[PDB]
Amino acid sequence: DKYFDEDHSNLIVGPVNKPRWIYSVSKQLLDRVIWAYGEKEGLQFTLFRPFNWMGPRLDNLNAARIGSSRAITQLILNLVEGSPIKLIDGGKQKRCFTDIRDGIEALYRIIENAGNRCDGEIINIGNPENEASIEELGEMLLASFEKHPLRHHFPPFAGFRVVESSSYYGKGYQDVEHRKPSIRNAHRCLDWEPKIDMQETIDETLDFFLRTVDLT
Amino acid sequence: MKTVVFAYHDMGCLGIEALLAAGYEISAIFTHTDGSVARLAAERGIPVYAPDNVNHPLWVERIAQLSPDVIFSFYYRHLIYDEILQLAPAGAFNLHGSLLPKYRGRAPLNWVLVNGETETGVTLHRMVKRADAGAIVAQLRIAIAPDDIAITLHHKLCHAARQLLEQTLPAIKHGNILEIAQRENEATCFGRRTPDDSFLEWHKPASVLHNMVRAVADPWPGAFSYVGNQKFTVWSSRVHPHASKAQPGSVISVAPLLIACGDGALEIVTGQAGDGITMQGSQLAQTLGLVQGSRLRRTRVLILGVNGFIGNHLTERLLREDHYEVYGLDIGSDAISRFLNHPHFHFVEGDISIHSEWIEYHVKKCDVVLPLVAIATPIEYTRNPLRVFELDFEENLRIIRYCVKYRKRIIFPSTSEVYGMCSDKYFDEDHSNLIVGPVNKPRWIYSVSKQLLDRVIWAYGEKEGLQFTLFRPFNWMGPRLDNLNAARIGSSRAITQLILNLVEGSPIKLIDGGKQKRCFTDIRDGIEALYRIIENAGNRCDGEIINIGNPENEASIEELGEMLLASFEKHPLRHHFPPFAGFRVVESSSYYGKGYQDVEHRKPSIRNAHRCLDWEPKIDMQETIDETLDFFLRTVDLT
Amino acid sequence: VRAVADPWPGAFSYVGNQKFTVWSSRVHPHASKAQPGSVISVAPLLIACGDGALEIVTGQAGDGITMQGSQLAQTLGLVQGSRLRRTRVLILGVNGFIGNH
Amino acid sequence: LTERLLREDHYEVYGLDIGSDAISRFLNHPHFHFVEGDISIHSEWIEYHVKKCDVVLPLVAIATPIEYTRNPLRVFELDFEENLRIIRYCVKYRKRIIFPSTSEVYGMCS
Numbered sequence A: 001d002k003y004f005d006e007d008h009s010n011l012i013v014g015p016v017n018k019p020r021w022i023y024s025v026s027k028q029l030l031d032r033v034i035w036a037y038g039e040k041e042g043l044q045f046t047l048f049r050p051f052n053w054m055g056p057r058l059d060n061l062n063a064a065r066i067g068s069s070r071a072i073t074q075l076i077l078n079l080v081e082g083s084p085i086k087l088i089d090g091g092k093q094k095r096c097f098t099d100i101r102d103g104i105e106a107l108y109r110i111i112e113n114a115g116n117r118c119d120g121e122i123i124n125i126g127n128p129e130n131e132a133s134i135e136e137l138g139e140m141l142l143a144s145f146e147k148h149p150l151r152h153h154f155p156p157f158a159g160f161r162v163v164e165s166s167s168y169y170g171k172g173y174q175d176v177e178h179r180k181p182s183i184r185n186a187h188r189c190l191d192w193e194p195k196i197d198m199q200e201t202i203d204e205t206l207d208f209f210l211r212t213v214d215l216t
Numbered sequence B: 001m002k003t004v005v006f007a008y009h010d011m012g013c014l015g016i017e018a019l020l021a022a023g024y025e026i027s028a029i030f031t032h033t034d035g036s037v038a039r040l041a042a043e044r045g046i047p048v049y050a051p052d053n054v055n056h057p058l059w060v061e062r063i064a065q066l067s068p069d070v071i072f073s074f075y076y077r078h079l080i081y082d083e084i085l086q087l088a089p090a091g092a093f094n095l096h097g098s099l100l101p102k103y104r105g106r107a108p109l110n111w112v113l114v115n116g117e118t119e120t121g122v123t124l125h126r127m128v129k130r131a132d133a134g135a136i137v138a139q140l141r142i143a144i145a146p147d148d149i150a151i152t153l154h155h156k157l158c159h160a161a162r163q164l165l166e167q168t169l170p171a172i173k174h175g176n177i178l179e180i181a182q183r184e185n186e187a188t189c190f191g192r193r194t195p196d197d198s199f200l201e202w203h204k205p206a207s208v209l210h211n212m213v214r215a216v217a218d219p220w221p222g223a224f225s226y227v228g229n230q231k232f233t234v235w236s237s238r239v240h241p242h243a244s245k246a247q248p249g250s251v252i253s254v255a256p257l258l259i260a261c262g263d264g265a266l267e268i269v270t271g272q273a274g275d276g277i278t279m280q281g282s283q284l285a286q287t288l289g290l291v292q293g294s295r296l297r298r299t300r301v302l303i304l305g306v307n308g309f310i311g312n313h314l315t316e317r318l319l320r321e322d323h324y325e326v327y328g329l330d331i332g333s334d335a336i337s338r339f340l341n342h343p344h345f346h347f348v349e350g351d352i353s354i355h356s357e358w359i360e361y362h363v364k365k366c367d368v369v370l371p372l373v374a375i376a377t378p379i380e381y382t383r384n385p386l387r388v389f390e391l392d393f394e395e396n397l398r399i400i401r402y403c404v405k406y407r408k409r410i411i412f413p414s415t416s417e418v419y420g421m422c423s424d425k426y427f428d429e430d431h432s433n434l435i436v437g438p439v440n441k442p443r444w445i446y447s448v449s450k451q452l453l454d455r456v457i458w459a460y461g462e463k464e465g466l467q468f469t470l471f472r473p474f475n476w477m478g479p480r481l482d483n484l485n486a487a488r489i490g491s492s493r494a495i496t497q498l499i500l501n502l503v504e505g506s507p508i509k510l511i512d513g514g515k516q517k518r519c520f521t522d523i524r525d526g527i528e529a530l531y532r533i534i535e536n537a538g539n540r541c542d543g544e545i546i547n548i549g550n551p552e553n554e555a556s557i558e559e560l561g562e563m564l565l566a567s568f569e570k571h572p573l574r575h576h577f578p579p580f581a582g583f584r585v586v587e588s589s590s591y592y593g594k595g596y597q598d599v600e601h602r603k604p605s606i607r608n609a610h611r612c613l614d615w616e617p618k619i620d621m622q623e624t625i626d627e628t629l630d631f632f633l634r635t636v637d638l639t
Numbered sequence C: 001v002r003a004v005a006d007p008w009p010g011a012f013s014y015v016g017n018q019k020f021t022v023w024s025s026r027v028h029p030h031a032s033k034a035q036p037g038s039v040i041s042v043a044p045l046l047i048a049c050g051d052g053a054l055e056i057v058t059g060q061a062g063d064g065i066t067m068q069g070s071q072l073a074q075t076l077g078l079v080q081g082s083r084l085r086r087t088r089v090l091i092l093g094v095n096g097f098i099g100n101h
Numbered sequence D: 001l002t003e004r005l006l007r008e009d010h011y012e013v014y015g016l017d018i019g020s021d022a023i024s025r026f027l028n029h030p031h032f033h034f035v036e037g038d039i040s041i042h043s044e045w046i047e048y049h050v051k052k053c054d055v056v057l058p059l060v061a062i063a064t065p066i067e068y069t070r071n072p073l074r075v076f077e078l079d080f081e082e083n084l085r086i087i088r089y090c091v092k093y094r095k096r097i098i099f100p101s102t103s104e105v106y107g108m109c110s
């Protein structure tokens, strides 16, 4: 679907021989169990689905050294250590990046649960307006990095390089070509609307992490 | 000219060199990881690559970029195929180590020694769809000395190749070559030799055996035999026409170590006991304990939920064979009571959530575990999602873990429902994507639960060596598929539910029109395939996921209903039951409740089954309908 | 690199997290105000040392195949840029004779 | 020992073991009560019988030297831990225990 809908979209994962979906399927089974408990035992719940939230503290440069971090924070490690930014399978796949500030605001509203409008609700939280390919993310990041005050402390850019997903994630990786959320439920239950634009999130994030590097 | 080379090992280096000295421009070299072809390429400043599959689009695209005139293959191990081969206008030639069309298979250097040929050679032929079949561009004979061994002949061939290329390579560079086609009715082919192919069978002639030790002498693995439980390797042999009334395999003497063969005797000049160091025969004789004397229970299957539809039928099948011992536990026992007197059947009435001592002890004791305990009647997915989750998922995950703990083989029953509303014409175990609906459509809790289990078993296999085989049944049906009683609560699969309708005189409802279809498989077909999986011939089922269904028996629920009705009307017992109340379309919600969603079509790919089991469904649907109907009608008490 | 050249394990270094091995070297008295460890050029692959530069003639990134330096430079992502908490002790019975001391 | 005890009339023999080929000949004996079990799994039976019987002879072990070096931990767990559990059932239910020590306990005594 053009818009992943909490109440109508179908869920699609790959073959069992594509273990990257173990996470997806695990989280889905939990959503279903919570749902059953809600229906069959009165559990009061609210499920929220973040859409590529990013900003300061999204992982750390150190974990990124092992690939154990999300894209944005990983690419920052690249610029920092002077290694090239690899675009898994061309990096043409896109995502909708959401500023952590927007995300936390929506979540806050959910905790507030004004009018109990969130009970039994499944709510996506993302900014459908910040859709961008990983390649574009890499460029925007690079642009900011070049203008940054601390730039001169790090090595010269080693450039962008297309890489086979297998050589980064190992055998059994498969990915999502596009991901955009429907934010109707969020609007209906929280009267919420994402506001911060992607570029601003990129700047915030980059700054935080660059000032994380000990220079000496 | 300009070329792209695919080389490896020795032939690879002489090939690249010959090519260089001949004035060719090498755009790139493709080789493998581990004289090193890479080092050479590196030393010459020729871009070298080692992908696992050069046939991949990216590479094909990149190789095309280089725009090569001709392609050469000098002992490249992976297989280069058409797609890329035809990118070279001048063609693609390969250098094979035999006098084609003879020994066109692989491992010719060894095979020719095995069969004791008197000569061999190198052939540079064109690459065509068929392996080593292409028109010959040049060939060159080599005499195999009586005292030649794999390694010494290897150099012989290398030297020959260096000479053949040296002169026929400049020829190709222009256009002076004749594609002398191959005499197809003379070609011989051989396959990969495994170290088990170098086993010595003393009943054969000393000549034969002697060629064996030569064929695979050091640096190759070598010819081996056994002294009781002990395995030793013969590195140096020596045929003795010196007869010996001694029976083949017996030791004629220990100095020299002379073994009696079917024809003449073989002298073991040097060899090694086990992974020991090499030593002279006389010493090897001692370290093996030789003197003048000759050289060289049933499977326990654990079935949990043995009284079930799959369970009882599988038990019947296994009990037929003699090499099986069946251990089973279940809440009920009416389906397996007929086996209680069988010596190889050990049943016990238990609950997977209570009787731990027995269950664990038996996973620990048996050889294969088949956890068939579950709830697989759709109505229950929406009606009792949590009971399904706990039994189908949690209870089984516990058994899966007993299996990894005691390193046992587990043949876990997956489901065709794991594919969900997949859109492929054929649901493929290794390629189809899995599609389910929203969380507000609880019918998928079963599908998703079984899928997570498949994935966990898969991780245990990959990360912890668990030996497994997942099998997915596609609407299997036949006698005992549920029971008329459970059907009174909707707790049964379609076929058995519709029979209850005919029996009680209530209408057959077609959920949402009943236009959705399924591929119905006869339980006899299913059990046969499963049996094969237990047999696991050649271990061809390890780590495999196998669908089991008859793609030929596709039918809509409406058609199933008609076929059933037709049989029912012709059944001898018909007059005992009320008049047909007719078919009636019904909203799924009024039968399954809120949150139901279904599969519009389900057909399996049965390739894997064919490949791993050499299995193929046989029984046609109508026959299954009859069987099933008859069983259940004769279940009804008439009085 | 000579001392442990093939068939020996070989001399190695790191490009960030990546480890690579130098099989063929070549000293260049050719100065370079470049600080030691930084890449002077990628063709030939010339690394600035404490005294003079070292040219990596052939090497391999990780466990990959050997290749000429220029190519090794690319496969490592090199351009003109530089190459290459406290311990927690748990004491149970810490108040004891050995422990407190 | 079972053969020996089964000869006398004043004995009732209860036994558990992984195997049963050596004692199958006694399965028909009225005074012999055998059950195929594992000391590390079948607790209900083991505890109930230490509680029910008069003397306990914990003969489960691994006593083939190669195993001491080859599988030291398996030896430790079975020979020591599993048995320490039986010893304790005995003190819990105040039962007589005829424990099988070993000449190997003397080691290289002089």
Ligand SMILES: O=C(O)[C@H]1O[C@H](OP(=O)(O)OP(=O)(O)OC[C@H]2O[C@@H](n3ccc(=O)[nH]c3=O)[C@H](O)[C@@H]2O)[C@H](O)[C@@H](O)[C@@H]1O
Residues within 6 Å of the ligand: A023, A050, A051, A052, A053, A069, A070, A071, A072, A074, A075, A085, A086, A087, A088, A089, A091, A093, A095, A134, A175, A176
């Ligand atoms: O916050 C989100 O919505 C989701 O973020 C991640 O999943 P994903 O976005 O697929 O993966 P990232 O690691 O964030 O990177 C996105 C894509 O960029 C690409 N990428 C990443 C890293 C890199 O160095 N290069 C590169 O091209 C990969 O194809 C990767 O899948 C998490 O795995 C999800 O649990 C989470 O819900």
Ligand SMILES: O=C(O)[C@H]1O[C@H](OP(=O)(O)OP(=O)(O)OC[C@H]2O[C@@H](n3ccc(=O)[nH]c3=O)[C@H](O)[C@@H]2O)[C@H](O)[C@@H](O)[C@@H]1O
Residues within 6 Å of the ligand: B376, B377, B378, B415, B416, B417, B446, B473, B474, B475, B476, B492, B493, B494, B495, B497, B498, B509, B510, B511, B512, B514, B516, B518, B557, B598, B599
């Ligand atoms: O053996 C199979 O492969 C699968 O069978 C069942 O799932 P399913 O085939 O969807 O459901 P059935 O109860 O067998 O009936 C098939 C369809 O017939 C229709 N039906 C059923 C009953 C009835 O009275 N009327 C009717 O129209 C329903 O739409 C139903 O989904 C099980 O739920 C799966 O776990 C199993 O893998």
Ligand SMILES: Nc1ncnc2c1ncn2[C@@H]1O[C@H](COP(=O)(O)OP(=O)(O)OP(=O)(O)O)[C@@H](O)[C@H]1O
Residues within 6 Å of the ligand: B304, B305, B306, B307, B308, B309, B310, B311, B329, B330, B331, B332, B350, B351, B352, B353, B372, B373, B374, B375, B376, B391, B473, B476, B482
């Ligand atoms: N808690 C339990 N303990 C032991 N056995 C159980 C338990 N719950 C269910 N079972 C058993 O599981 C058995 C197998 O289930 P059933 O025959 O209904 O389906 P199935 O043969 O797996 O069907 P399909 O092959 O269509 O999935 C039942 O006969 C039942 O006795």
Ligand SMILES: Nc1ncnc2c1ncn2[C@@H]1O[C@H](COP(=O)(O)OP(=O)(O)OP(=O)(O)O)[C@@H](O)[C@H]1O
Residues within 6 Å of the ligand: C092, C093, C094, C095, C096, C097, C098, C099
């Ligand atoms: N159950 C327990 N839980 C926690 N600490 C304990 C317990 N039993 C004893 N201890 C501690 O262990 C500490 C260490 O023992 P202690 O100082 O007597 O000897 P030690 O320093 O080990 O002597 P040596 O070095 O001569 O063997 C004691 O100070 C005591 O507090």
